[PDB]
Design a protein around this ligand. Sequence first.
Ligand code: CL
Ligand code: CL
Ligand code: CL
Length: 457
Amino acid sequence: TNPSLLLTGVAYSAFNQTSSDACHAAKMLILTSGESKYQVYKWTRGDFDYYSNLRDVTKMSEEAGEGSAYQALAHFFRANYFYQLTLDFGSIPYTDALKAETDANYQPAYDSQEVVLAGILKELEEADKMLEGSDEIISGDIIYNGNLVNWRKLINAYRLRILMSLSGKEKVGDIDVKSEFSKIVADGPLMESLSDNGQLIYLDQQDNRYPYFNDSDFGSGRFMDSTYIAELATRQDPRLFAVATQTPNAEKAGKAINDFSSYDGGDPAVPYSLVNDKAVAGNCSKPAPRYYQTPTNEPMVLLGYVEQQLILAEAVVRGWIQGDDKIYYESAVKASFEFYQKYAVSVADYLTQDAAAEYLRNDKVAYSSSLSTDEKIERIIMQKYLPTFLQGSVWLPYYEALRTGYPDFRRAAGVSLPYRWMYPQDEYNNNATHVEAALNEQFGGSDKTSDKPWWLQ
Ligand SMILES: [Cl-]
Ligand SMILES: [Cl-]
Ligand SMILES: [Cl-]
């Protein structure tokens, strides 16, 4: 082996992450054949599966030369997995992780969420610095074909993602959140267009195909959530056509593809049996068939230009940086249309830049200085949320709803949105002392999905 071969594997695994479960929690999909615990906020324990991925990252770093670009990339991959892990749980193994075998008698101590977040922000800072000005020629880079500047852009965008998630904090470790954010924007580099997306391209070849291709979970029981359809339809958003089918009955009636009334979903917060009746009757939309019938569908975007620009828009509104928030917002929306136009081939004519410009003039979408601050934030977060259908943002749109309040996810009376996940049973079984110490440091001994983690306090 060699680091190039290992990079290919590490990069594929990281950039191929996606979560249909998250899309139930984020009110895009429903299950009508049974109760989805994600749809109705009944999850309990999470899992530590990303530690296996982290062990592969470690192997790639150990095989590479000290100070090499591969080592910089390892910091990026570590940051991405640790960020996702800490958002799930709070305190997690970090500094003490990955030093013994997974099945060793020794199991790792947990670091506080603040320590993890500050740590990975510093790892990303180090990665950006390591790559700066580098003439190193790497191989196996299936994301950016060896362009180290593109990696720096992605690293910096990721730092902004993390920092914006910490909008409720002045400091994280010794890092001043707003001043660090501003410094990164000033220094750059940042993604400049959709071409700079941190995304994985799929190919019609063994082990290289889109992850939902021929996924059996797309048959019976899977439909669009009525609230997501409504968010799109009320904005006259033609990305609706790209993500969803018409209802079977609307198709039968010969309603136009761009007739917003020909799309409908099921109510996620009523008993599923009632919504199954609506779906059986032919009155619910399903995910577009390209999501499971095409071997390359669309690239999986770990972190893209659309999100980056909307992070920047929010930072302007919050006063963290100067800039034109309207054009950050509009550049993001326009780029999202450009993305869907490429991959939603059957509805591409509705997704031109002329269509984007019209969409941006719609009620509920149009952005201007006269809007209230809360309205601006809602606009921005909504545009971050809408294009994350079956995408590489994984649970992040759910956590952004916890941070910002947007969207306000439909749920039955008395149902709370979980803040986090409980620790895996395996941790209680084999790492009990360290788990107990983590619960005592965080929540006075409690481990509940309703325990509010540090980043939201
Ligand atoms: Cl090397
Ligand atoms: Cl570990
Ligand atoms: Cl478990």
